[PDB]
Enzyme design. Structure first.
Site, PDB file in Angstrom:
ATOM      1  N   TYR A   1      -8.731   0.590   8.505  1.00  0.00           N
ATOM      2  CA  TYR A   1      -9.965   0.037   7.479  1.00  0.00           C
ATOM      3  C   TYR A   1      -9.510  -1.476   7.130  1.00  0.00           C
ATOM      4  O   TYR A   1     -10.453  -2.113   6.743  1.00  0.00           O
ATOM      5  CB  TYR A   1     -10.027   0.822   6.304  1.00  0.00           C
ATOM      6  CG  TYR A   1     -10.394   2.242   6.709  1.00  0.00           C
ATOM      7  CD1 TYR A   1     -10.188   3.351   5.832  1.00  0.00           C
ATOM      8  CD2 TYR A   1     -11.266   2.643   7.485  1.00  0.00           C
ATOM      9  CE1 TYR A   1     -10.702   4.697   5.995  1.00  0.00           C
ATOM     10  CE2 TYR A   1     -12.009   3.834   8.183  1.00  0.00           C
ATOM     11  CZ  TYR A   1     -11.458   4.818   7.191  1.00  0.00           C
ATOM     12  OH  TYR A   1     -12.109   6.198   7.527  1.00  0.00           O
ATOM     13  N   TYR A   2      -8.254  -1.877   6.894  1.00  0.00           N
ATOM     14  CA  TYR A   2      -7.943  -3.209   6.758  1.00  0.00           C
ATOM     15  C   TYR A   2      -8.428  -4.192   7.689  1.00  0.00           C
ATOM     16  O   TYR A   2      -8.887  -3.761   8.788  1.00  0.00           O
ATOM     17  CB  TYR A   2      -6.415  -3.264   6.396  1.00  0.00           C
ATOM     18  CG  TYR A   2      -5.947  -4.547   6.115  1.00  0.00           C
ATOM     19  CD1 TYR A   2      -5.951  -5.541   6.880  1.00  0.00           C
ATOM     20  CD2 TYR A   2      -5.266  -4.521   4.504  1.00  0.00           C
ATOM     21  CE1 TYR A   2      -5.556  -6.911   6.165  1.00  0.00           C
ATOM     22  CE2 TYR A   2      -5.169  -5.862   4.116  1.00  0.00           C
ATOM     23  CZ  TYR A   2      -4.856  -6.870   4.883  1.00  0.00           C
ATOM     24  OH  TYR A   2      -4.730  -8.202   4.446  1.00  0.00           O
TER      25      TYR A   2
END
Length: 282
Positions: free
Chosen positions: A18-19
DNA sequence: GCGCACCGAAAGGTGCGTATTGTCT
């Protein structure tokens, strides 16, 4: 829209993938660990692994070997399609900020529901800790590359008790309050959007879209919804009564994996697609 | 959980189940 997903070991890679500030920390707990501003991917991965890092003992040892260890809880906030369109195609940056605020305010209420247990002499007490460690990640595209403003709020499986001890989060209150928290996000977003001068069109579900963008235009930028509908139609299923198993199969099995792409070129496509659909962003 | 079995060690802790709108994870 607001959905939750309990994250376990097998999802640590997914959660890590998700980063302004697309990745930001939030939570009194985060503050307690000295975390603020942009998320540090390294600290994030260990926290997911249950490492407070300050030279403290690793967490969740009591987890049963025959049970899955939980690394967190993902709360995915997604804006109405018209909102994603106005912000990402038309280019209204204030809408992005509006979304971020609605997410932050909702998470404050999710945090007020943070709890943990403590067993004293065989007697178990449920304590409302009121603190969370959250990694928020804002994204802008769907699996089909349509404008899709959403944030993955990864609540790590940890909370500090009144006695200063850290333990796994009893997520009950948050998980069961998903519908309610989704309504809070909806309310805050609508409020923020109205402050920008947009009129909203509600449709009796609690949901809304910007009044100047119609349903056909929305669907023109909702490829995933179209794929889901085709799946039900192929199976000869009525979307109004599909079981959970059928619903999950329709959504997961028709879902493409995130790929690569030229964002600048994609934006140009969106703008051209919007014109073709006859959208007037004002 | 609708309190248990099983983890580690603190007559202590954890998963489990929970969830169910849409723009569609």
């Amino acid at each position: 829209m607001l959905s939750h997903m309990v994250l376990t070991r097998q999802d640590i890679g997914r959660a890590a993938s998700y980063y302004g500030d697309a990745s930001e920390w939030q939570g009194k707990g985060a503050e307690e660990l000295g975390l603020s501003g942009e998320v540090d991917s390294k600290r994030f991965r260990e926290l997911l692994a249950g490492n407070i890092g300050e030279g403290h003992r690793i967490m969740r040892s009591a987890t049963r070997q025959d049970s899955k260890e939980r690394i967190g809880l993902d709360l995915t906030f997604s804006a109405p399609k018209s909102v994603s369109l106005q912000a990402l195609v038309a280019g209204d940056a204030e809408i992005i900020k509006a979304h971020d605020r609605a997410v932050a305010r909702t998470l404050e209420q999710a945090e007020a529901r943070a709890q943990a247990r403590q067993k004293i002499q065989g007697k178990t007490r449920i304590e409302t800790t009121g603190n969370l460690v959250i990694g928020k990640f804002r994204h802008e595209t769907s699996r089909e590359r349509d404008p899709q403003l959403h944030t993955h709020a990864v609540i790590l499986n940890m909370t500090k008790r009144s006695d200063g001890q850290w333990r796994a989060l009893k997520n009950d209150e948050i998980v069961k309050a998903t519908r309610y928290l989704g309504a809070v996000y909806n309310a805050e977003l609508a409020h923020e959007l109205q402050k920008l001068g947009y009129q909203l069109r509600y449709g009796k579900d609690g949901n809304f879209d910007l009044a100047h963008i119609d349903r056909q235009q929305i669907e023109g930028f909702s490829k995933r919804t179209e794929q889901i509908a085709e799946w039900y139609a192929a199976r000869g299923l009525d979307p109004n009564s599909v079981s959970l198993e059928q619903k999950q199969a329709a959504k997961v099995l028709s879902r493409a994996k995130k790929t690569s792409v030229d964002r600048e070129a994609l934006r140009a496509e969106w703008q051209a697609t919007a014109k073709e659909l006859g959208i007037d962003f004002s």
